[PDB]
C-alpha cells in the first residue's frame, strides 16, 4: 500500500456555531408546550419519511405512495424494479423460514 | 462382539503360597487401597473409561486412597489391568490433627506421620 507523504490540512471545527450551540432546542415542545405540537413535526426531510421509519422495502413503497405520481420516468422505473427485487428477497430468500 | 467380561471367582481366591510371596495375612486384612493409573483408557471400552473417572484415577502415577470394601473392589476389578493396587500401611499409626500436616506417602506404601528431610542418624 501507498501512504500520503504529507499531512492533510488540519480540520477546524467551530463547536459554538449557531447550529451546534442550539442543537436540541424545542425537542420538548410537546411536554413543555401543552402538546400542541409533537416533536416529530420538527423533523426536516423527505416528505415520505418525516416522523417515520421502516426497512428498505417499506421506504421504497412509502416513497412511491407519497410522490410516485410526481416522479420521473427513469426514477419510477428504477423504483418499481427495486420493489420487486426486495419483495422477492424478503419473502422467499434467507436463512430463517 | 466385544462385551463386558465376568471373571470366574477362582481368580480372586488366593493360595497359601501367594500370602508368603506378597506378605499379606488372610486375617486382619488391610483397610485402604493405594491405586494409581499406569495405563491409558484410550483404545479401551467406554465402561472402563467411566470407572476410571469415578475412581478419581484421571491422572496417571498419582495415588488415590480407596476403601477396601466389596463395592469398591467390584469397580476396581473392572479396570484391574490399567491400575496398580498397593496396600496402604501405617507404620507409626493414623495421622492426628497435630501430624496431619507432616505426613508423606512413601513409594513403599507407608504413610509416615513425621517427615524431616534429615539424615536418619
Amino acid at each position: 500500500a501507498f501512504v500520503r507523504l504529507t499531512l492533510p490540512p488540519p480540520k477546524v471545527v467551530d463547536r459554538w456555531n449557531e447550529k451546534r450551540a442550539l442543537f436540541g432546542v424545542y425537542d420538548n415542545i410537546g411536554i413543555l408546550g401543552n402538546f400542541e405540537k409533537h416533536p416529530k413535526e420538527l423533523i426536516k426531510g423527505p416528505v415520505w419519511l418525516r416522523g417515520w421509519r421502516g426497512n428498505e422495502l417499506q421506504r421504497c413503497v412509502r416513497k412511491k405512495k407519497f410522490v410516485g405520481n410526481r416522479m420521473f420516468i427513469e426514477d419510477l422505473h428504477n423504483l418499481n424494479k427495486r420493489i420487486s427485487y426486495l419483495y422477492k428477497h424478503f419473502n422467499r430468500h434467507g436463512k430463517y423460514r | 462382539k466385544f462385551t463386558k467380561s465376568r471373571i470366574p471367582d477362582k481368580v480372586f481366591q488366593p493360595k497359601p503360597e501367594d500370602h508368603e510371596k506378597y506378605g499379606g495375612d488372610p486375617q486382619n486384612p488391610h483397610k485402604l487401597h493405594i491405586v494409581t493409573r499406569i495405563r491409558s483408557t484410550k483404545r479401551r471400552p467406554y465402561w472402563e473409561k467411566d470407572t476410571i473417572k469415578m475412581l478419581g484415577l484421571q491422572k496417571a502415577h498419582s495415588p488415590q486412597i480407596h476403601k477396601n470394601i466389596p463395592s469398591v473392589n467390584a469397580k476396581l476389578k473392572v479396570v484391574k489391568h490399567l491400575i496398580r493396587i498397593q496396600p496402604l500401611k501405617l507404620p507409626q499409626g493414623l495421622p492426628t490433627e497435630e501430624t496431619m500436616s507432616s505426613t508423606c506417602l512413601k513409594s513403599t506404601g507407608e504413610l509416615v506421620v513425621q517427615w524431616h528431610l534429615k539424615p536418619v542418624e
Binding site: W16, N17, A21, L22, F23, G24, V25, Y26, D27, N28, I29, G30, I31, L32, G33, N34, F35, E36, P39, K40, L42, I43, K44, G45, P46, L49, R50, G51, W52, R53, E56, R59, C60, K63, N78, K81, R82, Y85 | -
Partner: protein, 196 residues
C-alpha cells in the same frame, strides 16, 4: 434522552447504485464456454470496476423513534437535579441587566465562577428583556432559550444553567404533572376536564 434527541431527527442521504441502476450492462460480455475467461453476465456487476455496489447505503434513510413520554420527562428532572447538586444551576429572579454590553455579561460570569458556557432560560420568548437579548445575540457560548425550549442535550452542552424564578415554577408544574396522571384517552391537545 440525549441520544434520542440526537438520533430521532437523523436522516442520511447516502446512496449507491445497484447493478440494476448503473448505465448499460444489459448484454452478456462473452460466451460461457471456449474463452479461457471467468464467466460473467454483465459489465456492471459488483466484481467489476464501474459496477454496482452489492450492499451500499440505500436512498434516504431515517432513524426515527420515540422515547416514552414519561422517560423523556424523567430525563429532564434528572438533568435539573444534576446541575443543582453539582453547583452548576443558578436561580435568578429576572433576566433584567443594567447594560446591553455583552462584555458585562461575560465579566459577571467570571466574577461568579460560572462556566465557559452558560445556558439562560426565560419564561416566554415574547417578554424576554431587551438588554439580555442584545447581550446574548453576539455571544457564542451564552445562549438564551425560552422555558419551552429547555432540553437535556443543551444542558449537557452548556456548563452552567441559569433559570428565572417564573421558569422554575413553569418547569415544576409540567414535569410533576407527568407522574400522577392517567394514560391518554386521546391526544392531550384535545379538550380535557382539568388540563389547559
Amino acid at each position: 434522552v440525549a441520544i434520542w434527541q440526537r438520533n430521532f431527527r437523523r436522516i442520511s442521504y447516502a446512496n449507491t447504485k445497484t447493478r440494476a441502476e448503473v448505465s448499460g450492462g444489459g448484454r452478456k460480455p462473452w460466451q460461457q464456454k471456449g474463452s479461457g475467461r471467468a464467466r460473467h453476465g454483465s459489465i456492471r456487476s459488483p466484481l467489476w470496476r464501474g459496477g454496482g455496489v452489492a450492499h451500499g447505503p440505500r436512498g434516504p434513510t431515517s432513524y426515527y423513534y420515540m422515547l416514552p413520554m414519561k422517560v423523556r420527562a424523567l430525563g429532564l428532572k434528572v438533568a435539573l437535579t444534576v446541575k443543582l447538586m453539582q453547583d452548576d444551576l443558578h436561580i435568578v429572579d429576572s433576566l433584567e441587566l443594567p447594560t446591553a454590553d455583552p462584555q458585562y455579561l461575560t465579566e459577571l460570569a467570571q466574577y461568579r465562577h460560572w462556566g465557559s458556557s452558560v445556558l439562560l432560560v426565560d419564561l416566554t420568548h415574547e417578554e424576554m428583556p431587551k438588554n439580555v437579548v442584545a447581550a446574548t445575540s453576539g455571544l457564542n457560548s451564552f445562549n438564551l432559550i425560552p422555558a419551552v425550549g429547555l432540553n437535556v442535550y443543551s444542558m449537557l452542552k452548556h456548563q452552567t444553567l441559569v433559570l428565572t424564578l417564573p421558569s422554575v415554577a413553569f418547569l415544576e408544574d409540567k414535569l410533576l404533572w407527568q407522574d400522577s396522571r392517567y394514560t391518554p384517552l386521546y391526544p392531550f391537545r384535545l379538550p380535557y376536564s382539568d388540563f389547559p
